[PDB]
């Protein structure tokens, strides 16, 4: 009973650990790429409006 609960905790930990690490690594790398994409995107549009201001 005692160790059954110990390993129940351990199995839950490790199971959800694998899940969380998958979530973590994959989506983090993905979002980092997404972040730099959005960075360059917004910067380009910012400069677009800058040139519009100079056009005025």
């Amino acid at each position: 009973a005692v160790k059954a609960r110990q390993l129940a905790h351990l199995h839950s930990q490790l199971t959800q650990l694998s899940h969380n690490l998958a979530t973590t690594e994959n989506l983090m790398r993905m979002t980092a790429v997404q972040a730099e994409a959005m960075r360059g995107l917004g910067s380009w549009h910012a400069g677009l409006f800058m040139a519009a201001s100079k056009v005025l």
């Binding site: 677009l48 040139a51 519009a52 056009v55």
Partner: protein, 55 residues
């Protein structure tokens, strides 16, 4: 007289030609104005494109 027939037919043919000529010159001058508009249009287009370039 046959000369009068030749006279009138000469005037008829040449006058038809003259009327066609009058319409032709009018067509050409209309096209002249059209081409002027065309030139102005493309000039403005180029200007806008240059504005985009600087932008």
């Amino acid at each position: 007289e046959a000369r009068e027939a030749a006279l009138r037919k000469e005037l008829e043919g040449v006058r038809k030609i003259n009327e066609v000529i009058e319409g032709m010159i009018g067509t050409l001058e209309r096209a002249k104005g059209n081409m002027g508009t065309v030139s102005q249009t493309v000039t403005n287009a180029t200007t806008l494109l240059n504005t985009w370039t600087r932008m």
